[PDB]
Design a binder for this molecule. Structure first.
Ligand SMILES: [Cl-]
Ligand SMILES: [Cl-]
Length: 239
């Protein structure tokens, strides 16, 4: 059966969310999602350009950035929260819930399959793919095949790191597969290779490092450390 996707709660609003820091080199463009740092002040944003209105970054369209030290005035507390601290509190809790959902075996509605340690040149159907080792996506393209059902859910749950890179590293979606229904969970870090096309919601326990020029469609979560960008186009997957 189709795997049950995690509940994201408040953190569905974020394109990127980290405990410690979100950083970028120049040349990044983030769209359709918010940015958040949960456990450090706004000073832990690096590389971004504050825009006209409080919370805006020039690099960020249809979204705002958030940190718990954001005062009102001039920042704006998201509805319906009474304070920015309360908004960060619910976001922190809901991130933990969703990471834990993806880390727990088995999924409530689907049996676990083996995740290959190299995902290049494979075509995979929906399901839950688990391994305790590290996973690489580099020999070629990973094609995710929704078998004609736009609701098909893909969960990759990984006890080590996840790294895409050269010579391949791209993710292609066919037959109904959608970025919003793909989930990547690493107990280690997630590293996305230079100039690749990546799809899915990344829940890295430690950090997410997106390398030069990669294109992300999905979400980037670092539960305990940081999300770093290097000239990336990041688009939040539609709700
Ligand atoms: Cl684990
Ligand atoms: Cl999508």
């Amino acid at each position: 059966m189709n795997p049950l996707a995690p509940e994201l709660g408040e953190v569905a609003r974020f394109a990127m969310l980290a405990s410690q820091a979100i950083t970028t080199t120049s040349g990044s463009a983030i769209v359709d999602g918010d940015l958040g740092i949960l456990d450090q002040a706004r000073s832990y944003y690096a590389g971004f350009t504050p825009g006209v209105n409080a919370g805006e970054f020039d690099e960020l369209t249809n979204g705002l950035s958030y940190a718990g030290d954001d005062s009102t005035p001039p920042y704006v507390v998201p509805v319906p929260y009474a304070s920015m601290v309360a908004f960060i509190n619910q976001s922190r809790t809901d991130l933990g819930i969703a990471y834990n959902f993806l880390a727990a075996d088995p999924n409530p509605n689907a049996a676990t399959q083996v995740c290959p340690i190299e995902l290049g040149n494979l075509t995979l159907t929906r399901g839950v793919y688990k391994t305790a080792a590290d996973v690489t996506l580099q020999t070629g393209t990973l094609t995710l095949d929704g078998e004609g059902d736009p609701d098909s859910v893909f969960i990759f749950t990984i006890g080590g790191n996840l790294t895409s890179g050269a010579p391949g590293g791209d993710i292609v979606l066919i037959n109904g597969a959608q970025a919003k229904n793909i989930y990547w969970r690493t107990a280690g870090k997630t590293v996305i290779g230079t100039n690749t096309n990546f799809s899915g919601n990344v829940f890295a326990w430690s950090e997410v490092n997106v390398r030069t020029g990669a294109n992300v469609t999905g979400r980037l979560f670092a539960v305990t450390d940081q999300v770093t960008l290097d000239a990336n186009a990041v688009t939040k997957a539609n709700l």
